[PDB]
């Protein structure tokens, strides 16, 4: 039914910390992509709804998720953006795939317990 913000943080934050624990794969996901710094001027035309680990962490800590699938949607959006934008052979794409594999392993038992 209703999901309290502390209840959601306690169940979901370990799955986010598992992504942060990936060294070095989490590095290009820690801050919002800056197309100027990264020299990728077309980024915001292709990626209409950016997402990254810091934005997700801030939302989770401030109770911005009403139910667990809103959190899942944001994590999935972060990976889908990076797969959309980056070439399949690029380092960032490969890092994205590793994080996405880690996340699915983390998220399934949490969504089973929650529900």
From TrEMBL:
The membrane-spanning stretches of this chain are none
Name its cellular compartments.
Nucleus
Sequence ranges assigned to domain Bromo in this UniProt record:
21-93
Q: What is this protein called?
A: histone acetyltransferase
Q: Where does this protein come from, organism-wise? A: Homo sapiens (Human)
Print the organism lineage. Eukaryota, Metazoa, Chordata, Craniata, Vertebrata
């Amino acid at each position: 039914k209703i999901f309290k913000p502390e209840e959601l943080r306690q169940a979901l934050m370990p799955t986010l910390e598992a992504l942060y624990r990936q060294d070095p794969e989490s590095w290009p996901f820690r801050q919002p992509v800056d197309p100027q710094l990264l020299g990728i001027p077309d980024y915001f035309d292709i990626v209409k709804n950016p997402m990254d680990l810091s934005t997700i962490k801030r939302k989770l800590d401030t109770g911005q998720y009403q139910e667990p699938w809103q959190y899942v949607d944001d994590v999935w959006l972060m990976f889908n953006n990076a797969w959309l934008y980056n070439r399949k052979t690029s380092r960032v794409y490969k890092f994205c795939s590793k994080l996405a594999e880690v996340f699915e392993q983390e998220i399934d038992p949490v969504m089973q317990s929650l529900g």
